[PDB]
Design a protein around this ligand. Structure first.
Ligand SMILES: O=C(O)c1cc(Oc2ccccc2)ccc1NS(=O)(=O)c1ccc(Br)cc1F
Ligand SMILES: [Mg+2]
Length: 559
């Protein structure tokens, strides 16, 4: 069937939309070519619609069915708990889109009488009505990028706040435990960046002669069929569930997940969806399961040997045993055809790789540097272009989420995050006297509130002390950063070192946590290094909930 149908009504913005980076005194010291930075708007919605709208082709076979049964068997061991309205409410972000029924996030989080009562009515309605397609709102997403040698906005589809809290009640525990019980070490969201690298390296070393590749599905959400979503529910149904949760899941599947009506910001009927909605609780879990299912089966059809998958939603990387150059290239092409038949056609044609550092997955790749002792150390990095453009934008405007803080946390060991992000943002926080202020950021889609002054601890626990002493990065990494700085108009190393040494001094003089930030975060800037010993607060961190599952589009907040 058609992934989408359109009435003709436009996808409209609910307020004015900014497209250009404002000429700001502070963002200009980070990035000069401000005209290269842009944010998508609804004005490009039509271009996106045309790309995601098409009829799907799907042919299932024995390999698919065999893998599905293997996955259901493992799912059979799980027992999902069912959240109370109180717990579900507490999982709602403060800035979550308000309900059209007289209440918003604040009320939801505060358990206000009107919020709670309506949520109860929406839940009871899910137990009673098993058919009526639930209404969803479709919007053009606003994201920042750097012009390339422009991307049309993505389309987000999400139900009302009331429905979202109900999704949590019935499926939060399921989407938080089942992916792991089903896919095991292959479920990528259970890993911290350091652990992801460890998994990729150990998997790479376990092969006699390794071969790996990333597989890019052309617009994955629209390739997801009604059949895929029902198969996905069949997996959830293997869980031991409370009757109400079992019915809720059944109803949510038929009324929301498999598709439904689309309404724009103006309240106009835009069309109908028969594919994956990006803004519902099961999107991350659902896509991971579906991508893994189709991929594991594709590998068997393609005769690839010793396949090890690493899946994060629609993002896939496969590492297997090489059977020779010619054969690998043929088996890969066979894989792509199997995937195409399963309704997961490629966007960028896949290419076999024999060098781990050259494999990009989750927009990232493994690279090597060295610690003070001189020992090689692997870490996760990525092209800094987007992180920097976004860091520029978040510097000129106020944003609910601070991607820069998230990029610092996940990419602490990288040369670009240390030299540029840390220096730029710490110097700004000092000048404004806001180092104490906690800011929000996302990790695997979940929203978190983090105190800048705790970064040293966080970084030590997640990456180890080596993150503060790495040097001698690979020629490959060095070149990518260099050319990026030239393109975006970012000041050279020498300038950042000067700013860094200045920020460092002002931080040390303050003592306390600030001095710790100065000692660890900026040890790369001074010649007279300081002894970097284990930070006390580091060994007392509860960073477990940080890497359990994916929640992008899930409207999830962890307090
Ligand atoms: O250790 C290195 O590999 C390295 C790479 C460079 O290459 C670059 C070229 C252009 C832009 C940025 C870096 C320049 C200096 C380097 N050595 S360094 O000055 O001790 C250094 C600077 C910043 C960080 Br953090 C870590 C470092 F150890
Ligand atoms: Mg894709």
């Amino acid at each position: 069937s058609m992934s989408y149908t359109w009435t003709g009504a436009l996808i409209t913005p609910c307020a004015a939309e900014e497209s250009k980076l404002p000429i700001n005194p502070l963002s200009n010291s980070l990035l000069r070519h401000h005209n290269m930075v842009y944010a998508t708007t609804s004005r490009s919605a039509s271009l996106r619609q045309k790309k995601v709208t098409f009829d799907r082709l799907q042919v299932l076979d024995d390999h698919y069915r065999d893998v599905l049964k293997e996955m259901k068997a493992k799912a059979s061991t799980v027992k999902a708990k069912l959240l109370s309205i109180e717990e579900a409410c507490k999982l709602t972000p403060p800035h979550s889109a308000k309900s059209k029924f007289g209440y918003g996030a604040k009320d939801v989080r505060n358990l206000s009488s009107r919020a709670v009562n309506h949520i109860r009515s929406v839940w009871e309605d899910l137990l009673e009505d098993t058919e009526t397609p639930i209404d969803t709102t479709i919007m053009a997403k606003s994201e920042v990028f750097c012009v390339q040698p422009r991307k049309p906005a993505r389309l987000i589809v999400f139900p009302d706040l009331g429905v979202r809290v109900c999704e949590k009640m019935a499926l939060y525990d399921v989407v938080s435990t089942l992916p792991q019980a089903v896919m095991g070490s292959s479920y990528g969201f259970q890993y911290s960046p350091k652990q992801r690298v460890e998994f990729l390296v150990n998997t790479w070393k376990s092969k006699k002669c390794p071969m790996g590749f990333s597989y890019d599905t052309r617009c994955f959400d629209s390739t997801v069929t009604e059949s895929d979503i029902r198969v996905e529910e069949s997996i959830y149904q293997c869980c031991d569930l409370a009757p109400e949760a079992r019915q809720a899941i059944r109803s949510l599947t038929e009324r929301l997940y498999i598709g439904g009506p689309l309404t724009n910001s103006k309240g106009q009927n835009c069309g109908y969806r028969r594919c994956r909605a990006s803004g519902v609780l099961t999107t991350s879990c659902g896509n991971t399961l579906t991508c893994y299912l189709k991929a594991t089966a594709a590998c068997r059809a393609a005769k690839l040997q010793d396949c090890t998958m690493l899946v994060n939603g629609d993002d896939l990387v496969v590492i297997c045993e090489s059977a020779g150059t010619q054969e690998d290239a043929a088996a890969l092409r066979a894989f792509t055809e199997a995937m195409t038949r399963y309704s997961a056609p490629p966007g960028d044609p896949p290419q076999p790789e024999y060098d781990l550092e050259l494999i990009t997955s989750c927009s990232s790749n493994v690279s090597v540097a060295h610690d003070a002792s001189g020992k090689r150390v692997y870490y996760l990095t990525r092209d800094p272009t987007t992180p920097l453009a976004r860091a520029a934008w978040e510097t000129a405007r106020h944003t609910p989420i601070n991607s820069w803080l998230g990029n610092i946390i996940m990419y602490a060991p990288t040369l670009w995050a240390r030299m540029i992000l840390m220096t730029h943002f710490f110097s700004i926080l000092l000048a404004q006297e806001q180092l104490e202020k906690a800011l929000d950021c996302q990790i695997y889609g979940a929203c978190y509130s983090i105190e800048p002054l705790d970064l040293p601890q966080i970084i030590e626990r997640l990456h180890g002390l080596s993150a503060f002493t790495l040097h001698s990065y690979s020629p490959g990494e060095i070149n990518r950063v260099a050319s990026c700085l030239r393109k975006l108009g970012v000041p050279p190393l020498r300038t950042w070192r000067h700013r860094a040494r200045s920020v460092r001094a002002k931080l040390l003089s303050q003592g306390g946590r600030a001095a710790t930030c100065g000692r660890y975060l900026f040890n790369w800037a001074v010649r007279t290094k300081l002894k970097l010993t284990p930070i006390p607060a580091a060994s007392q961190l509860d960073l477990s909930g940080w890497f359990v599952a994916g929640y992008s589009g899930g409207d999830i907040y962890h307090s």
